[PDB]
């Protein structure tokens, strides 16, 4: 509302909000570092963008006896991006302070307490654990120590390489690299399984077909196995919760990225007027983002209205008292695509 | 077209008003040779620069510290001079190189932000003025400053990094380190003349540059997809020195000001409309005047569209002008004595 | 629609009376439904 | 949820969804005199 | 615009306590910078609760 | 009533009361602290908003031998919000002075006297007790000590964790966290049972199916049990009163929150004129609030008039002498939703 007070020519520029959702990075990990490590001591966190950069921060050559070095080179040889190093006792503080963190990686030490207090609905984090270091017990009870958290996954067994001498690589370090490679190539909704390990790493123990079948229910352990014609592959993409909602990693991670993307986009429309023109803009922005996901194949459905729906309005989602109390409510439904874990062929 | 102005200390003291330079001979006629800003002025002219202004805060010998430079830039008389002098478009301050990067503490980080804010304040004297900014030498401080900068004038700021070394030498045989702001400013003038304002000044070769003062690999973290990114001057294998990046300091990804060409193109359109609008300041506010204004604006926009300046296959998607007793105002607006014109545009994307 | 956004009432029998007119009063009723900001944004995600 | 500060809140539908899935119907248990190699009911795959 | 820092940093939990009392807070967000987070007056009824 | 005294334009604003019911937090606990604890000494109460803040208020590291530290860390690891620490001897004084408090938590010490004088009808409070520390005696008489208060519940047995060394976590500390998580996700009307314990805690003694059946009547003991496929779950949602009115915790807690929310709203109409226009606004405000509860599923009924009713008027709830004495009387009925404790399947 320009106030015309002197004769002349006045210039106006449209300032109404323009809203759209932008895809973020869905593979930024955080590695746990032991207290005695000198590199991490005396600092909140360390950001490392390359394997050579990690050596630059260090002052020694590559050490195959320290878990940090082997885990880092295993992560980088499998692809990925920049990662953060945080002390285990400081995970509960530093992780919420970093808004770009997506994955929490055990990196070969106990981070059970940190996961339970961080990975919660709406937070957008995901956790990767390490399986037991011993033989897989036949009767299938070697899962009791794990808490059925739908935001975490466990991988077995530990990996070994030629450069390894006496300490085996924790599987979570290599799996984190696989997540970024799969996400960049195929997408977050793609299952991070049936893909090779790029580092030429070998599992410490072999897993039979029936043994995996024993541990693929309930709090499942995703398995890294060697196949005669395909080499080493990642087999299994199940979380620690067996319900239909969050049985598979891709479904849980897809919702994490969708919530994170829309939440960031919605922060530019917080104190906007709560009336019809705003509702049209938010509905269009969310509809375009979900339409793009359906085009790429991330949602299942013949037509878009069978894959998602967005509701917002004066009588659709909120009441008159909600508006007077400053609440705008948006309901979003999504039909995530699920992995075809089993393929059944029947002939006549 | 973009006519840059140079702000810095000069060996020969002069008045507080700017000067007009069309060639290095005029520069020599007013100024003595040898000096950091003189070398950049030579660099600007030698890259293809036609004309530019020079403004002096003081003599070259009275350099004190970073805070002194910022305080000198905040003096009121500079803002009035550039506001009065109409055809100035770009602001260049190459004197920031003369100060060392001692540490990466909060003291240095804040000073860099205030230099950016002080320059952007000088850019708000008139609409359409661009500011060309510099960044700290190491990528760590530059990334810290980019993320922590908070201003409503991010739209008018463009930053280039790193520093550049050229074949020019002092009496001692040392390569002269020059800011890349002088080089791009000549490119913009060349791009405005040969190709126009709506052509991005990126993916274009520089001249008489030995090598960037720093490398490529260390600059990966400075560029950012959503916002607060930098523009890189980068050497190429078998392609010469290149300008890699055409993004401003705008943060929001949806803003149309995220590229230097779009914001300058809109300002270029705005300047012409203001010039055309001045002829209608007291015209009768009836249908005849509306048709006259609509015809002239439509013809000029159609001319710009046929040069590829606007994104569109037909005229309707390219632009649209509304002016009448309806669709632009009401009868109460006529009695108030104000005329309202609404223009819609569709900019290009590099 | 304008009927839901605002309303103005003035008249002999709707806003004033005979006594008010005799005493020099003129009463106008104005009602506006202002727009409140969206202080809180609530996103509800479901697997439908 | 109950908003407390200005910003964006995320709610996940925690209402139950039900699905009955068929399971195994033929696992037997054998009771008799066996001689295990290691010294309870034990599972045997083949 | 044209600022150095806020006198005291605030968290989401702290602001929620103040927003109930009617104290508008100046917050810092990494993606956006220093912003004004709050538009409430000192009266907490349905009619006169928001400044606009 | 503007007094017209000079010729000009007069401006007024409508000042008739506008009434609306807002939902308040339903899971604010108060923890009892022993007298000898140095943190609470010399202060009326301490408000703690986070686990890290509690350590900041303290000056030592985490102590697994002090009951306060284990109770607080178990409460936060299960989810929750800000809580107050009050001395046991000062509960009867400080608690009524805090109007945001909803739950009263024993936290492992005798607070029976405080409950008997605080948890009364209309007060809006609720109590969580601790069960016996010994074996649950088979004949079913290990419950005589508890007072059949319809505002209290008892949970058995005490919990243990890896970090615990010689003192077991009182169950009420962990259960208080479960109340907040359930209220935030499903609502105050949903039973805080059949939900996992998020802290990775374990019950100290196993409870058989038959043994729970002995203590599920009368002054019931809600039992925390471990199941083979779902881990540790909270089993049982019964109060200490076995009548049909207040047998279940959700029914008692839903009324507690409903009364508190309406009571706060009605404080804006204490001295309003007692005539028809005021009765219209009070009924509309309450009807809107109850309609919201029925929509969310908190009240059972096919139609709104099967779920609730509101009565207020000149000849409906109050008489002529009631009005002349300054009494406005509102009768509110509510059909609370009850849990499906037993599921019976009949096959033909």
PDB file of N, CA and C in Angstrom, chain A residues 2 4 7-9 11-14 18-22 47 49 264-265 268, chain B residues 127 155 220-221 226 252-254 257 263 266 270 273-274 277-278 281-282 338:
ATOM      1  N   UNK A   2       1.338   1.646  -1.179  1.00  0.00           N
ATOM      2  CA  UNK A   2       2.134   2.858  -1.294  1.00  0.00           C
ATOM      3  C   UNK A   2       1.276   4.083  -1.014  1.00  0.00           C
ATOM      4  N   UNK A   4       0.731   7.706  -1.874  1.00  0.00           N
ATOM      5  CA  UNK A   4       1.038   8.725  -2.867  1.00  0.00           C
ATOM      6  C   UNK A   4       0.978  10.091  -2.197  1.00  0.00           C
ATOM      7  N   UNK A   7       3.669  14.279  -6.586  1.00  0.00           N
ATOM      8  CA  UNK A   7       3.459  13.894  -7.988  1.00  0.00           C
ATOM      9  C   UNK A   7       4.715  13.266  -8.573  1.00  0.00           C
ATOM     10  N   UNK A   8       4.530  12.165  -9.292  1.00  0.00           N
ATOM     11  CA  UNK A   8       5.657  11.454  -9.865  1.00  0.00           C
ATOM     12  C   UNK A   8       5.250  10.056 -10.281  1.00  0.00           C
ATOM     13  N   UNK A   9       6.252   9.194 -10.429  1.00  0.00           N
ATOM     14  CA  UNK A   9       6.056   7.805 -10.824  1.00  0.00           C
ATOM     15  C   UNK A   9       6.545   6.909  -9.693  1.00  0.00           C
ATOM     16  N   UNK A  11       7.113   2.889  -8.089  1.00  0.00           N
ATOM     17  CA  UNK A  11       7.473   1.540  -8.504  1.00  0.00           C
ATOM     18  C   UNK A  11       7.034   0.563  -7.425  1.00  0.00           C
ATOM     19  N   UNK A  12       6.320  -0.481  -7.832  1.00  0.00           N
ATOM     20  CA  UNK A  12       5.916  -1.562  -6.948  1.00  0.00           C
ATOM     21  C   UNK A  12       6.483  -2.881  -7.451  1.00  0.00           C
ATOM     22  N   UNK A  13       6.845  -3.747  -6.510  1.00  0.00           N
ATOM     23  CA  UNK A  13       7.275  -5.102  -6.815  1.00  0.00           C
ATOM     24  C   UNK A  13       6.426  -6.074  -6.014  1.00  0.00           C
ATOM     25  N   UNK A  14       5.962  -7.129  -6.676  1.00  0.00           N
ATOM     26  CA  UNK A  14       5.117  -8.110  -6.011  1.00  0.00           C
ATOM     27  C   UNK A  14       5.911  -8.772  -4.892  1.00  0.00           C
ATOM     28  N   UNK A  18       5.973 -16.967  -2.805  1.00  0.00           N
ATOM     29  CA  UNK A  18       6.005 -18.028  -3.802  1.00  0.00           C
ATOM     30  C   UNK A  18       6.555 -19.274  -3.125  1.00  0.00           C
ATOM     31  N   UNK A  19       5.796 -20.365  -3.180  1.00  0.00           N
ATOM     32  CA  UNK A  19       6.069 -21.541  -2.369  1.00  0.00           C
ATOM     33  C   UNK A  19       6.316 -22.748  -3.260  1.00  0.00           C
ATOM     34  N   UNK A  20       7.402 -23.466  -2.982  1.00  0.00           N
ATOM     35  CA  UNK A  20       7.688 -24.737  -3.628  1.00  0.00           C
ATOM     36  C   UNK A  20       8.622 -25.530  -2.728  1.00  0.00           C
ATOM     37  N   UNK A  21       8.629 -26.844  -2.919  1.00  0.00           N
ATOM     38  CA  UNK A  21       9.417 -27.755  -2.098  1.00  0.00           C
ATOM     39  C   UNK A  21      10.666 -28.160  -2.864  1.00  0.00           C
ATOM     40  N   UNK A  22      11.812 -28.100  -2.192  1.00  0.00           N
ATOM     41  CA  UNK A  22      13.093 -28.452  -2.785  1.00  0.00           C
ATOM     42  C   UNK A  22      13.645 -29.699  -2.110  1.00  0.00           C
ATOM     43  N   UNK A  47      33.930 -32.188  10.543  1.00  0.00           N
ATOM     44  CA  UNK A  47      33.313 -32.439   9.249  1.00  0.00           C
ATOM     45  C   UNK A  47      34.394 -32.884   8.272  1.00  0.00           C
ATOM     46  N   UNK A  49      35.085 -34.345   4.342  1.00  0.00           N
ATOM     47  CA  UNK A  49      34.488 -34.387   3.016  1.00  0.00           C
ATOM     48  C   UNK A  49      35.188 -35.346   2.063  1.00  0.00           C
ATOM     49  N   UNK A 264      10.760 -27.928   5.772  1.00  0.00           N
ATOM     50  CA  UNK A 264      11.628 -26.814   5.403  1.00  0.00           C
ATOM     51  C   UNK A 264      10.900 -25.825   4.505  1.00  0.00           C
ATOM     52  N   UNK A 265      10.108 -26.330   3.558  1.00  0.00           N
ATOM     53  CA  UNK A 265       9.366 -25.448   2.666  1.00  0.00           C
ATOM     54  C   UNK A 265       8.314 -24.648   3.423  1.00  0.00           C
ATOM     55  N   UNK A 268       8.744 -20.974   5.362  1.00  0.00           N
ATOM     56  CA  UNK A 268       8.628 -19.698   4.672  1.00  0.00           C
ATOM     57  C   UNK A 268       7.198 -19.180   4.631  1.00  0.00           C
TER      58      UNK A 268
ATOM     59  N   UNK B 127      17.613   2.588  -7.080  1.00  0.00           N
ATOM     60  CA  UNK B 127      17.191   1.251  -7.471  1.00  0.00           C
ATOM     61  C   UNK B 127      17.938   0.801  -8.719  1.00  0.00           C
ATOM     62  N   UNK B 155      19.482  -9.505  -2.208  1.00  0.00           N
ATOM     63  CA  UNK B 155      19.144  -9.535  -3.627  1.00  0.00           C
ATOM     64  C   UNK B 155      20.144  -8.750  -4.468  1.00  0.00           C
ATOM     65  N   UNK B 220      34.703 -26.540  -3.282  1.00  0.00           N
ATOM     66  CA  UNK B 220      33.498 -27.337  -3.490  1.00  0.00           C
ATOM     67  C   UNK B 220      32.394 -26.980  -2.501  1.00  0.00           C
ATOM     68  N   UNK B 221      32.753 -26.632  -1.266  1.00  0.00           N
ATOM     69  CA  UNK B 221      31.771 -26.372  -0.223  1.00  0.00           C
ATOM     70  C   UNK B 221      31.157 -24.980  -0.296  1.00  0.00           C
ATOM     71  N   UNK B 226      20.586 -24.357  -2.806  1.00  0.00           N
ATOM     72  CA  UNK B 226      19.398 -23.593  -2.435  1.00  0.00           C
ATOM     73  C   UNK B 226      19.684 -22.095  -2.415  1.00  0.00           C
ATOM     74  N   UNK B 252      16.401 -17.671  -0.625  1.00  0.00           N
ATOM     75  CA  UNK B 252      15.251 -18.491  -0.987  1.00  0.00           C
ATOM     76  C   UNK B 252      15.403 -19.031  -2.404  1.00  0.00           C
ATOM     77  N   UNK B 253      15.088 -20.317  -2.572  1.00  0.00           N
ATOM     78  CA  UNK B 253      15.254 -20.965  -3.868  1.00  0.00           C
ATOM     79  C   UNK B 253      14.201 -20.514  -4.872  1.00  0.00           C
ATOM     80  N   UNK B 254      13.033 -20.085  -4.398  1.00  0.00           N
ATOM     81  CA  UNK B 254      11.946 -19.695  -5.288  1.00  0.00           C
ATOM     82  C   UNK B 254      12.088 -18.282  -5.835  1.00  0.00           C
ATOM     83  N   UNK B 257      15.332 -13.550  -8.100  1.00  0.00           N
ATOM     84  CA  UNK B 257      16.531 -12.732  -7.999  1.00  0.00           C
ATOM     85  C   UNK B 257      17.785 -13.558  -7.746  1.00  0.00           C
ATOM     86  N   UNK B 263      17.834 -10.216 -12.097  1.00  0.00           N
ATOM     87  CA  UNK B 263      17.635  -9.005 -11.307  1.00  0.00           C
ATOM     88  C   UNK B 263      18.054  -7.762 -12.082  1.00  0.00           C
ATOM     89  N   UNK B 266      15.373  -7.091 -14.920  1.00  0.00           N
ATOM     90  CA  UNK B 266      14.169  -6.453 -14.397  1.00  0.00           C
ATOM     91  C   UNK B 266      14.431  -4.981 -14.107  1.00  0.00           C
ATOM     92  N   UNK B 270      12.683  -1.807 -15.610  1.00  0.00           N
ATOM     93  CA  UNK B 270      12.109  -0.806 -14.719  1.00  0.00           C
ATOM     94  C   UNK B 270      12.580   0.600 -15.064  1.00  0.00           C
ATOM     95  N   UNK B 273      10.666   1.940 -18.140  1.00  0.00           N
ATOM     96  CA  UNK B 273       9.272   2.248 -17.837  1.00  0.00           C
ATOM     97  C   UNK B 273       9.154   3.542 -17.043  1.00  0.00           C
ATOM     98  N   UNK B 274      10.077   3.772 -16.107  1.00  0.00           N
ATOM     99  CA  UNK B 274      10.097   5.040 -15.387  1.00  0.00           C
ATOM    100  C   UNK B 274      10.349   6.201 -16.339  1.00  0.00           C
ATOM    101  N   UNK B 277       7.183   6.592 -18.266  1.00  0.00           N
ATOM    102  CA  UNK B 277       6.125   7.087 -17.404  1.00  0.00           C
ATOM    103  C   UNK B 277       6.223   8.562 -17.084  1.00  0.00           C
ATOM    104  N   UNK B 278       7.432   9.127 -17.114  1.00  0.00           N
ATOM    105  CA  UNK B 278       7.596  10.544 -16.803  1.00  0.00           C
ATOM    106  C   UNK B 278       6.873  11.429 -17.814  1.00  0.00           C
ATOM    107  N   UNK B 281       3.013  12.201 -16.672  1.00  0.00           N
ATOM    108  CA  UNK B 281       2.855  12.516 -15.254  1.00  0.00           C
ATOM    109  C   UNK B 281       1.560  13.282 -15.006  1.00  0.00           C
ATOM    110  N   UNK B 282       1.185  14.175 -15.918  1.00  0.00           N
ATOM    111  CA  UNK B 282      -0.034  14.956 -15.747  1.00  0.00           C
ATOM    112  C   UNK B 282      -0.977  14.839 -16.938  1.00  0.00           C
ATOM    113  N   UNK B 338      -4.587   8.915  -9.281  1.00  0.00           N
ATOM    114  CA  UNK B 338      -3.464   8.019  -9.508  1.00  0.00           C
ATOM    115  C   UNK B 338      -3.806   7.000 -10.586  1.00  0.00           C
TER     116      UNK B 338
END
